[PDB]
Structure formats: structure tokens, C-alpha cells
């Protein structure tokens, strides 16, 4: 088993009021069975597509979930992941860095 | 499309025998050699997918792939090995496997001190027929077709006896006609004149 | 393993015929082939996996289907003179060695009455032959069989012998008229002369002939030419 | 350098029937095909434009390849369970990775084909493409089976020839996007860690391929120990992102320089804020 | 193109 490493970011640099893509990229996890959702202010968003399953050289899987959104200061965006190695769901907020 | 060495070959003494096949659609990557006995289903002996040559007991094969001449061959021959040999190739996309025209191979075994002769065989009383057979002749000798319309003669054949450690060839001729003569029956003998002609 | 349903079959022109093929290896690929020695062995249809059938070099006049993964039946809607050949059903994985069954010998004829079984007779060796060679050669002869659907076997004292035995590879046409000709086949059996001189031994030439099926109707007064075994017997003398 | 990679994953689900099979294909770092056995309509799907103009018969053939491999993999799962004589009520994962790397001389440089069971290396094709390497004792059984059945010849035939043909074809069909290299757009930011401490972050975005090197040097001292790194991540439009940060004392910022090395850049870039 | 030549089995 392996613990997933999470990264939450945007395709383009965050611009308030401009359309963009929220990305939650998980990597280095095993086995493949995992649940990943995106949260706008703590609410799951429907119509969320995700990439096709693959893995790296070290047999560790990696996935990418993405969605279309427009960022504003008020809204807070996060990624929730649940895995068998995770005792409880892991939440990572989206920071502009 | 694949074109094999369809012309028949017959190598009498045990020695190297070589046969190849060429294909016109360079995209294959899959190759095989099959052997079929008369009246039986063919059998695989060699499969090749890589350009490097492969060894196999009394057999070997190789694929240039630019020349695209597939070669199978035998280190030493035996009478048993003589059979039809088929070349086959499968395209790497559809995986359709196509065979080429079969290459018939006939062995001629060496006969130690052969005494060629012709004999006549009386039938069982209810058979109502007569025939002649020419046997124990050198393998090199060939057998000719009957000029006469009512005379039927078969081709040569090899038999082997493991009990007496001896091998021999045979040819048979028969006719329903009245004036059936053995001497006369083999009109085109075309053989060394060391032949016995009994009654 | 693999099995082809009809080893031999004879049918009239214009009557559809089906050949069943079964395999136990659960191979993905299956193919049909025709061999009649004209061009060697050509392909007809080939199916990959199930419910997928693609054509070959000689696909005209042939129909196939793939309902099950292990069965690949071949159907001929209208039997013709050209379709007479030896059919083979092969099966394999995409690039592995191909496996086919025993084969199906098929002959299409104009008229059902033309089918005739062979007449067989065994001919005893010459005394001069054993005098000089010190070994005897018995000869078996089958005549008047149409078509070439016969298998010849020698038997000695209830035992099918294989050593010192020869059989003509292909039969000779009695009259080479090339529209309709009856065939003739021959075989030889060579043994030691001392063996032939003992009277207790019994030599029996045997010919199996795969003729008409029972269901095919027969009106001619002559005995119906169904699959039968015709044998000729002889004993050693002097 | 260019390469083609193929990844197969078979996840065995017990009590719900047949396992789930997922197959993906990568040319360099762009995905072009992916197949899923548990999809509504199981068939090869294109994710790159240069395969979308491929003939439909090609897609049919590829779908058949993937379906056959799915059946083969379910049997492998059952066989592997039997080899480890493990319970039938446990989920198990089987992974397969194979590909070929093209050399600078327009010919095969290397090939690889390997299997792994539950994240553990199971068996690997040696670089000679004629022998095998078995990790544990149960993998030696598969080594026996394949050495006797001569599967190594099949795998070498696939890796030395047809994979290279496919790779060259794809490269020519999509040279506008597969042979292009997008130089990374880079910039450096800073944030306050403390009243007398500060974090410097070098950023690189919009580059292809993913391979890139970011380093921090202190007036000529390239020490990775204080440097913080993150895995290269995709932006979702075919390009990847990567940043590297270091904590520094305020006033010593002038002595530090970021170094970025990438194919798209003719010469490695040195950056400072 | 996928490596679908033989039966990989195991």
C-alpha cells in the first residue's frame, strides 16, 4: 500500500472573474480503488470529469480530476480524497501560492 | 499474397534440402512452416517472428525481412520426412494467416544390390483378371504411362521392412484386354536390360 | 482438441451443405481452408473472436457465421462442380501456431446414380518371384469406385499391418473422359517367402468406402451405395 | 529522444463477476488511446487528434486486441491466485508495462516489458530480450512456462519491429504537436515566512515534455537539502507545471539563483528576483 | 499498436 500525494491548482494563473479549470492531481497511491471529489465551499460539484487511470515507473498510480469554474475571493475551493490507507477523508484547500 | 517454392524437388541421398517462400505484402512479422502427409492434416515444425536464424534439432530457419526470403532447411534427410511443406504468414494487423503453394518433397532411397525384375501374378479363381509387377529396381528409374488405351499402370511406390531391415520400390500394371503380355505390357520399359520375364 | 464433423461427404449440385467445426482450446482465431492441389491450400473465410467474420482469397460462393466462440460452421448455399476439394478448419491464437482438424473430403456430382462402390480382389504372388527374390509380394486391387472416398488397409491374422506395406497415393481414372470417370486403386504387401509358404497365415485386403448417407433417396434397382467395407482374402499355399 | 509506452491494469473484484480492465497508451507524454472493460460501450477511445483521423478498421482491430488481452488477464489473475493459493475473497491488482525508446539514429534504443502483482515487481523482460528475471519463486513458474513456450521471441519481435513502425508513423502523422517543444514560461515569487525569514519560489509552466530540472544555487552552491520540490503536474491541456522553493534569510536573496534546464530552452536559464 | 501477438497468459 501507498499513501496518495495530492496537489490542487489551476490550469492558468488564478484571475478573479475569469474562467479557469480546477485540478486535483493525486499520485503515488496503491491500490487503484480511491474516491476523489471537488468541493466548492464544502459542496460536491456534479458534472466533474476525470482523466484515464495510469501509473508511473514505480507501479504507483496517478489520476487527475478537473472542473470548469470562475474564481472569486469569497468562494473557497478544496479537494476531498478517500483511500483505503486513509483512516478518514483528507481535505486539501486550493491555495494560489 | 505469398508465393512459395511450388516446384517439386526430390533429393535421394541424405543431405541438405532447402526451401524458401516470398511474400508480396511486407507487413507480416509472423511466419511458420507446416508439414503435411498425403491425406493427413499438416503439422507445425517451425515458427519464426524475429530476423535472427533459429535452430531446431534436424531443422533451422531465418528471416532476412528486407529480402523477405523465409528459409527452412534440414541437416540430413530420411525417407519418412518426404511430405508436402507449406509456408504461412500472418499480417500483424488483421492476424489473418495465409499459406503459400505447397512444395511437394519426395525422397528416393538408395538400394543395395538391387535385382530389378518383372513378375506376373495369378488371381483368385473368382477374380477373373491378370497383372504384372516390376520391382526391386534402382530409385533413379522412372515409370512411364501406358500408351495403350485399355492398359492401366500405377506410379512407383516405396515400402520399408523393419523386420528384414530392407527397403524396396514397386510398380504395378494391369489390363482387362485379352492379349495382355507382361513383356508387351511394359512397352516403354526404358530400364537397364537385367529383367526376368516368367510365365 | 479440434474436430471437423464430416470426414467425407457427397452431394448433388444445387443442394446446400454445412460443415461443422468444433474446438476445445478456446482459441480466439478460426479459419477455413480449401486444398485441391491446384494452387496449394487457399483461405476462404477467417473469424476473430466471436460474431466477427472477414473474407479471404476465395470467398465467393461461401457463407459463414460465428454465434459461439468455439463453433465456426461453414455453409455452401449452392453446391457446384468447382467446390469439390478438401476442406480444413483451423484454430489458433493471433500469432501462435495454427491447429486444424482431420479435414473434410467433399465431392459434388451431377447425378446420384453415378456413385459406385469398389470391387476389390487380392492377387497371390508368383512362384518364380519367391524362387528368385526369396520374398513374396501380394497385390490388392480396387476398381470402379466413384468418387475417391476410400481408405485401404492390409490385415494379417486379424491384425492391421503397417510394415512392408505400400499404397498408391492417388487413384487412377479408368477412362480419362474428364466429365465422369471411375477410379482404380492398388496396394502391395511384401513379406518373407517362408512366411507366405505357411498355410496358417491369412492375408486380407480391406477397403472402406464412404458413400451416400442413408437419408439420401435411392430408386435404382442396384444395391444402394452407402458407406461400406469391402475385403478380399487369401491364404498361403505350397 | 522519443518513446512509446503502454500500461495495462487488471483489478479483480470478487463476488461481482469478471475483473475490471483498463488500458492506456502514451506517445512521449501525450495520451492517444485508452480502453476500459467496465465502460458502457467497451471500445478503444482516442484522446489525441492524430489518431482520430485513423481508419475505423484500425479502431476495430485495436478494440479486439484489448478485449483479447482482458480475457487473457482475467485468466492470469486466476492463475496467480492459484500460484499463491490465496483466498478467493480478496481483491488483487495486476499491472503490465511495455514500451520502446527510439535512439538518436532513428532506430530502436531500448525496449521494456514487465509485470507486477499487487504493487510488487513480479517478472521483467531482460534487456537482451531473450531471457527473463523472476522476482520471487512463483514468478519462476511463469519463467518456466514462457521459456518453454518461447514467448520471449514473440515479445522481441514486437519490440524490435512493429512498435518502431507504429512510433515513426505516429510521429510523422502528428509531428506538429509531438515533435514540437514548448519552452517553459518561468517566474519567481516570494512570501514572508517570518519577520526575518522569507520563501523564494521558482515557477515553470507551459512546457512539453514533462522532463525538466529546477535547482536552487546559493552564489554557486547547488544543495538540494534545503530545497523543497514537488512532482511535475499536468495543467490538463497537454502541458505540465513545476515549482521549487527555498527558505532564505532576508538580505541574502541577492546571492540566490534559480536554474532551469529543459529541452525547449536552447541554453539553461538562470533566474533571480 | 498493442502487443496482441500471442496469448501472454501467465
Amino acid at each position: 500500500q501507498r499513501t496518495p500525494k495530492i496537489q490542487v491548482y489551476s490550469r492558468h494563473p488564478a484571475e478573479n472573474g475569469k474562467s479557469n479549470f480546477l485540478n486535483c492531481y493525486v499520485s503515488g497511491f496503491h491500490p487503484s480503488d480511491i474516491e476523489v471529489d471537488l468541493l466548492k465551499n464544502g459542496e460536491r460539484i456534479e458534472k466533474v470529469e476525470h482523466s484515464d487511470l495510469s501509473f508511473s515507473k514505480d507501479w504507483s498510480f496517478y489520476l487527475l480530476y478537473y472542473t470548469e469554474f470562475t474564481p472569486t475571493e469569497k468562494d473557497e475551493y478544496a479537494c476531498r480524497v478517500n483511500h483505503v490507507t486513509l483512516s478518514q477523508p483528507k481535505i486539501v484547500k486550493w491555495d494560489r501560492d | 499474397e505469398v508465393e512459395q517454392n511450388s516446384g517439386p524437388l526430390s533429393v535421394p541421398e541424405g543431405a541438405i534440402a532447402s526451401l524458401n517462400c516470398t511474400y508480396s505484402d511486407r507487413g507480416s512479422q509472423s511466419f511458420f512452416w507446416y508439414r503435411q502427409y498425403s491425406g493427413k492434416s499438416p503439422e507445425l515444425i517451425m515458427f519464426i517472428y524475429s530476423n535472427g536464424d533459429k535452430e531446431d534439432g534436424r531443422f533451422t530457419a531465418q528471416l532476412n525481412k528486407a529480402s523477405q526470403y523465409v528459409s527452412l532447411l534440414i541437416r540430413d534427410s530420411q525417407p519418412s520426412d518426404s511430405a508436402t511443406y507449406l509456408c504461412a504468414a500472418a499480417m500483424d494487423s488483421s492476424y489473418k494467416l495465409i499459406f503459400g503453394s505447397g512444395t511437394r518433397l519426395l525422397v528416393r532411397p538408395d538400394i543395395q544390390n538391387p535385382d530389378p525384375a518383372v513378375y506376373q501374378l495369378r488371381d483368385s479363381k473368382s477374380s477373373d483378371k491378370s497383372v504384372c509387377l516390376f520391382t526391386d529396381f534402382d530409385s533413379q528409374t522412372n515409370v512411364s504411362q501406358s500408351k495403350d488405351s485399355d492398359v492401366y499402370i500405377t506410379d512407383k511406390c516405396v515400402l520399408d521392412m523393419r523386420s528384414m531391415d530392407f527397403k524396396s520400390n514397386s510398380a504395378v500394371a494391369w489390363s482387362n484386354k485379352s492379349d495382355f503380355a507382361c513383356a508387351n505390357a511394359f512397352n516403354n520399359s526404358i530400364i537397364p536390360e537385367d529383367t526376368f520375364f516368367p510365365s | 482438441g479440434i474436430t471437423q464433423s464430416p470426414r467425407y461427404k457427397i452431394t448433388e449440385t444445387g443442394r446446400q451443405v454445412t460443415l461443422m467445426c468444433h474446438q476445445t482450446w478456446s482459441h480466439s482465431y478460426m479459419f477455413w481452408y480449401r486444398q485441391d492441389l491446384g494452387h496449394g491450400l487457399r483461405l476462404i473465410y477467417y473469424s476473430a473472436a466471436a460474431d466477427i467474420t472477414d473474407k479471404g482469397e476465395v470467398p465467393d460462393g461461401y457463407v459463414v457465421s460465428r454465434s459461439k466462440t468455439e463453433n465456426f460452421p461453414l455453409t455452401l448455399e449452392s453446391a457446384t462442380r468447382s467446390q469439390t476439394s478438401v476442406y480444413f478448419c483451423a484454430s489458433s491464437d493471433p500469432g501462435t501456431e495454427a491447429f486444424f482438424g482431420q479435414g473434410t473430403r467433399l465431392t459434388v456430382v451431377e447425378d446420384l446414380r453415378n456413385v459406385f462402390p469398389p470391387e476389390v480382389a487380392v492377387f497371390e504372388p508368383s512362384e518364380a518371384e519367391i524362387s528368385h527374390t526369396q520374398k513374396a509380394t501380394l497385390v490388392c486391387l480396387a476398381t470402379g469406385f466413384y468418387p475417391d472416398h476410400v481408405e485401404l488397409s492390409w490385415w494379417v491374422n486379424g491384425k492391421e499391418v503397417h510394415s512392408g506395406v505400400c499404397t498408391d497415393p492417388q487413384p487412377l481414372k479408368e477412362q480419362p473422359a474428364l466429365n465422369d470417370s471411375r477410379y482404380a486403386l492398388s496396394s502391395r504387401l511384401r513379406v518373407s517367402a517362408t512366411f507366405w509358404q505357411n498355410p496358417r497365415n491369412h492375408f486380407r485386403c480391406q477397403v472402406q468406402f464412404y458413400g451416400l448417407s442413408e437419408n439420401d433417396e435411392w430408386t435404382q434397382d442396384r444395391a444402394k451405395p452407402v458407406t461400406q467395407i469391402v475385403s478380399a482374402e487369401a491364404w498361403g499355399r505350397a | 529522444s522519443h518513446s512509446m509506452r503502454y500500461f495495462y491494469t487488471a483489478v479483480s473484484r470478487p463476488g461481482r463477476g469478471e475483473p475490471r480492465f483498463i488500458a492506456v497508451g502514451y506517445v512521449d507524454d501525450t495520451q492517444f488511446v485508452q480502453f476500459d472493460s467496465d465502460a458502457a460501450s467497451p471500445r478503444g477511445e482516442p484522446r489525441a487528434p492524430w489518431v482520430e483521423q485513423e481508419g475505423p478498421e484500425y479502431w476495430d482491430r485495436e478494440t479486439q486486441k484489448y478485449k483479447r488481452q482482458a480475457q487473457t488477464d482475467r485468466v492470469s489473475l486466476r492463475n496467480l491466485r492459484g500460484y499463491y493459493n490465496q483466498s478467493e475473497a480478496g481483491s488483487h491488482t495486476l499491472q503490465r508495462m511495455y514500451g520502446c525508446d527510439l535512439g538518436p539514429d532513428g532506430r530502436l534504443l531500448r525496449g521494456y516489458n514487465q509485470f507486477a502483482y499487487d504493487g510488487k515487481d513480479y517478472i521483467a523482460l531482460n534487456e537482451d530480450l531473450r531471457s527473463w528475471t523472476a522476482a520471487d519463486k512463483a514468478a519462476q513458474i511463469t519463467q518456466r512456462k514462457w521459456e518453454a513456450a518461447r514467448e520471449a521471441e514473440q515479445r522481441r519481435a514486437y519490440l524490435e519491429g512493429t512498435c518502431v513502425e507504429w512510433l515513426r508513423r505516429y510521429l510523422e502523422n502528428g509531428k506538429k504537436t509531438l515533435q514540437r517543444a514548448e519552452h517553459p514560461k518561468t517566474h519567481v515569487t516570494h512570501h514572508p515566512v517570518s519577520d526575518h525569514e522569507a520563501t523564494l519560489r521558482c515557477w515553470a509552466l507551459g512546457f512539453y515534455p514533462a522532463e525538466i530540472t529546477l535547482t536552487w544555487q546559493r552564489d554557486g552552491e547547488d544543495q538540494t537539502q534545503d530545497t523543497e520540490l514537488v512532482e511535475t503536474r499536468p495543467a490538463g491541456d497537454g502541458t505540465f507545471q513545476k515549482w521549487a522553493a527555498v527558505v532564505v534569510p532576508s538580505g541574502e536573496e541577492q546571492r540566490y539563483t534559480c536554474h532551469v534546464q529543459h529541452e525547449g530552452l536552447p541554453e539553461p536559464l538562470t533566474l533571480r528576483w | 499498436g498493442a502487443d496482441g501477438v500471442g496469448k501472454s497468459a501467465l
Side-chain angles (χ1 to χ4, degrees):
Chain A
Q1 289 178 346
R2 272 197 171 77
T3 170
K5 308 186 260 74
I6 320 178
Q7 288 204 53
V8 191
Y9 54 91
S10 54
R11 176 172 305 194
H12 305 80
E15 275 225 11
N16 306 293
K18 300 316 141 81
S19 168
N20 206 301
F21 285 152
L22 186 40
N23 295 4
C24 187
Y25 174 77
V26 304
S27 52
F29 69 105
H30 192 288
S32 64
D33 255 340
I34 198 178
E35 182 179 337
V36 172
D37 304 85
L38 289 191
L39 297 316
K40 164 260 167 172
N41 298 340
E43 276 202 40
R44 196 190 78 175
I45 317 108
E46 202 35 288
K47 306 310 190 62
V48 156
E49 292 199 37
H50 67 81
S51 92
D52 323 295
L53 166 66
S54 164
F55 55 79
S56 284
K57 273 269 177 167
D58 63 346
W59 311 112
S60 76
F61 294 63
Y62 64 68
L63 267 194
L64 177 64
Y65 284 68
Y66 50 81
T67 183
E68 178 186 61
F69 80 97
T70 321
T72 72
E73 157 141 48
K74 331 182 308 188
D75 291 332
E76 294 186 353
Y77 292 107
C79 187
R80 167 164 91 201
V81 316
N82 187 356
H83 194 36
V84 49
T85 71
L86 275 282
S87 65
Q88 287 180 341
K90 198 151 178 179
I91 311 307
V92 161
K93 333 172 178 178
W94 168 50
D95 180 3
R96 303 195 193 189
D97 305 297
Chain B
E1 175 207 46
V2 172
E3 276 147 351
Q4 211 202 224
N5 178 358
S6 162
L9 243 190
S10 85
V11 21
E13 289 171 301
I16 198 204
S18 308
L19 61 172
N20 53 336
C21 46
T22 61
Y23 40 114
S24 307
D25 290 3
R26 278 187 183 177
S28 315
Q29 303 306 312
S30 297
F31 297 85
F32 325 80
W33 272 116
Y34 278 101
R35 162 253 305 271
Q36 166 207 346
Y37 296 130
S38 63
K40 300 181 174 172
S41 68
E43 286 177 31
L44 185 91
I45 322 94
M46 289 294 265
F47 54 67
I48 300 290
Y49 317 104
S50 78
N51 296 330
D53 42 87
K54 201 173 283 186
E55 264 216 334
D56 174 75
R58 295 113 321 207
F59 308 84
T60 2
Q62 188 216 154
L63 261 69
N64 183 182
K65 96 174 167 197
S67 302
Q68 86 238 222
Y69 285 111
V70 70
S71 64
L72 103 99
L73 72 213
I74 64 296
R75 217 306 158 165
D76 144 306
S77 326
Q78 286 181 161
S80 79
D81 304 14
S82 83
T84 50
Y85 284 75
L86 289 168
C87 170
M91 330 313 270
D92 204 293
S93 151
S94 42
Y95 290 98
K96 144 169 70 170
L97 184 156
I98 177 53
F99 294 85
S101 312
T103 189
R104 164 164 9 85
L105 175 62
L106 294 138
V107 73
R108 318 168 132 175
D110 58 334
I111 324 291
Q112 274 284 66
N113 324 85
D115 49 273
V118 168
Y119 320 86
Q120 199 192 63
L121 273 88
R122 292 150 165 182
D123 60 349
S124 84
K125 292 330 94 77
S126 263
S127 334
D128 306 11
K129 270 103 60 195
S130 302
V131 263
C132 319
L133 81 87
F134 160 52
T135 188
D136 197 10
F137 58 103
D138 202 328
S139 54
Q140 287 172 356
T141 315
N142 47 335
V143 192
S144 49
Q145 203 50 37
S146 148
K147 296 281 179 210
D148 207 326
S149 46
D150 287 322
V151 158
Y152 322 126
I153 168 176
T154 79
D155 224 300
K156 56 180 174 64
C157 179
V158 73
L159 41 74
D160 176 19
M161 294 185 82
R162 280 136 54 179
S163 75
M164 305 183 68
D165 195 7
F166 198 83
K167 293 175 183 163
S168 267
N169 39 14
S170 60
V172 178
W174 89 90
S175 177
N176 291 336
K177 190 180 176 177
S178 61
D179 193 328
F180 178 77
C182 290
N184 173 16
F186 273 35
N187 164 33
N188 19 331
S189 80
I190 328 321
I191 47 60
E193 205 26 49
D194 319 307
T195 329
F196 303 37
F197 319 108
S199 62
Chain C
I2 317 189
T3 52
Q4 293 202 229
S5 161
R7 194 74 60 94
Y8 299 79
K9 182 82 176 184
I10 300 147
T11 180
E12 302 172 345
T13 78
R15 186 73 294 154
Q16 85 92 350
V17 179
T18 316
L19 309 194
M20 311 286 312
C21 183
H22 183 80
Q23 50 98 347
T24 301
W25 295 124
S26 151
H27 289 150
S28 319
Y29 265 96
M30 291 183 67
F31 326 82
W32 271 107
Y33 284 108
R34 159 220 292 278
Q35 171 174 50
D36 41 340
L37 162 61
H39 312 59
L41 152 39
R42 307 179 78 94
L43 180 64
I44 325 292
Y45 280 74
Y46 73 119
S47 168
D51 253 338
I52 282 164
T53 63
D54 183 6
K55 312 206 168 191
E57 26 190 35
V58 186
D60 41 56
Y62 289 78
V63 162
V64 284
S65 52
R66 200 96 158 84
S67 273
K68 290 97 191 181
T69 169
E70 271 150 336
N71 285 322
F72 187 17
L74 162 85
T75 86
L76 279 64
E77 269 298 352
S78 188
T80 71
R81 277 283 178 76
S82 67
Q83 274 147 332
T84 79
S85 73
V86 194
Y87 298 81
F88 290 94
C89 172
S91 93
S92 82
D93 297 316
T96 61
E97 143 191 12
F99 301 74
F100 41 49
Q102 314 279 315
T104 291
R105 213 98 45 201
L106 178 57
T107 307
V108 178
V109 298
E110 175 99 338
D111 254 334
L112 196 64
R113 34 201 151 221
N114 308 352
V115 190
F116 261 113
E119 291 173 341
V120 187
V122 59
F123 301 173
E124 322 219 72
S126 169
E127 294 270 42
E129 160 161 20
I130 59 182
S131 165
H132 175 24
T133 69
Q134 311 305 345
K135 40 185 53 68
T137 309
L138 287 86
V139 169
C140 182
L141 256 200
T143 40
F145 62 103
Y146 177 100
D148 177 8
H149 289 180
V150 296
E151 294 181 289
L152 182 156
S153 49
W154 274 108
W155 292 77
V156 166
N157 296 315
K159 169 181 183 178
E160 177 177 28
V161 284
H162 296 274
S163 90
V165 193
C166 156
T167 288
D168 188 4
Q170 297 162 341
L172 302 314
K173 349 283 182 195
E174 285 203 305
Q175 65 284 357
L178 196 134
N179 238 27
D180 179 301
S181 85
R182 298 178 321 279
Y183 297 75
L185 187 61
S186 69
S187 191
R188 316 95 173 93
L189 171 50
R190 205 153 173 179
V191 287
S192 74
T194 168
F195 183 85
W196 163 250
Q197 268 151 0
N198 177 0
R200 273 195 90 176
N201 293 312
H202 160 108
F203 309 77
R204 183 192 148 200
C205 173
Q206 176 162 343
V207 163
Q208 177 102 35
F209 163 86
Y210 306 86
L212 265 60
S213 45
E214 274 64 352
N215 290 88
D216 296 313
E217 297 177 348
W218 191 246
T219 72
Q220 263 59 20
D221 60 347
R222 311 188 273 267
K224 183 170 170 191
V226 308
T227 65
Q228 45 184 296
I229 304 189
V230 166
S231 73
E233 319 144 69
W235 314 73
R237 294 168 300 187
Chain D
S1 166
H2 291 282
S3 58
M4 152 172 284
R5 334 170 74 75
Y6 263 113
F7 304 94
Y8 299 133
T9 303
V11 157
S12 63
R13 54 164 99 105
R16 309 84 168 197
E18 70 300 296
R20 201 185 164 152
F21 185 82
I22 285 196
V24 303
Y26 276 120
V27 172
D28 298 11
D29 293 315
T30 191
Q31 184 183 321
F32 61 96
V33 82
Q34 65 95 330
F35 170 78
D36 192 352
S37 74
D38 201 85
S41 163
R43 56 172 44 172
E45 297 287 344
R47 309 305 197 195
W50 33 273
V51 299
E52 289 201 341
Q53 61 190 5
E54 204 37 276
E57 71 296 349
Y58 166 89
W59 292 120
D60 290 28
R61 285 152 187 195
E62 223 62 32
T63 305
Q64 299 301 322
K65 296 180 181 179
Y66 293 143
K67 289 190 180 181
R68 270 142 46 196
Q69 198 65 17
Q71 315 178 353
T72 310
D73 271 10
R74 321 195 174 189
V75 153
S76 312
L77 284 188
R78 289 193 192 282
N79 286 22
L80 285 179
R81 170 208 81 100
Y83 286 123
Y84 288 147
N85 75 282
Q86 286 163 335
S87 44
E88 302 213 322
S91 182
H92 297 287
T93 309
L94 173 61
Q95 316 186 50
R96 170 170 160 78
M97 158 201 294
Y98 69 72
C100 47
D101 305 345
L102 261 201
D105 213 319
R107 229 156 289 276
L108 176 99
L109 174 66
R110 90 178 288 255
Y112 49 74
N113 171 95
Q114 30 188 328
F115 303 86
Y117 185 70
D118 273 308
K120 154 181 173 61
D121 289 299
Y122 189 56
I123 192 182
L125 181 55
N126 302 345
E127 292 68 29
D128 55 77
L129 308 182
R130 304 192 45 196
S131 50
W132 305 83
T133 290
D136 72 334
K137 313 199 176 190
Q140 300 219 311
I141 309 174
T142 305
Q143 176 178 270
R144 304 177 181 286
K145 166 146 4 148
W146 287 355
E147 272 280 322
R150 280 96 179 186
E151 174 118 349
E153 298 301 323
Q154 287 176 45
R155 287 296 75 75
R156 189 172 80 255
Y158 170 84
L159 298 179
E160 291 180 346
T162 167
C163 94
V164 189
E165 189 239 357
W166 279 119
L167 191 34
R168 304 216 178 105
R169 208 170 95 88
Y170 290 130
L171 292 189
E172 176 86 30
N173 279 264
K175 55 155 40 189
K176 177 182 58 193
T177 71
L178 278 164
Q179 302 227 245
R180 69 85 167 83
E182 291 204 63
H183 54 76
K185 299 66 177 196
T186 64
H187 66 323
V188 179
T189 57
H190 93 298
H191 286 301
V193 187
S194 98
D195 282 58
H196 49 288
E197 301 165 47
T199 168
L200 277 199
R201 190 166 283 128
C202 199
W203 284 86
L205 310 172
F207 59 79
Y208 195 109
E211 214 280 356
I212 195 172
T213 305
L214 285 61
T215 310
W216 267 117
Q217 77 166 47
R218 301 176 68 175
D219 197 356
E221 278 188 330
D222 255 337
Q223 85 300 11
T224 59
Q225 336 314 124
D226 57 355
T227 322
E228 156 161 27
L229 215 32
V230 299
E231 278 197 54
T232 322
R233 63 208 204 195
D237 64 353
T239 206
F240 310 76
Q241 299 180 352
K242 190 170 189 68
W243 68 254
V246 58
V247 49
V248 304
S250 169
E252 280 191 45
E253 314 136 29
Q254 313 133 10
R255 80 197 273 255
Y256 288 72
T257 59
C258 180
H259 273 248
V260 61
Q261 325 186 5
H262 189 254
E263 145 166 352
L265 293 181
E267 287 194 29
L269 275 196
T270 288
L271 213 34
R272 37 164 39 190
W273 155 82
Chain E
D3 191 0
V5 174
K7 189 68 171 302
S8 93
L10 267 136

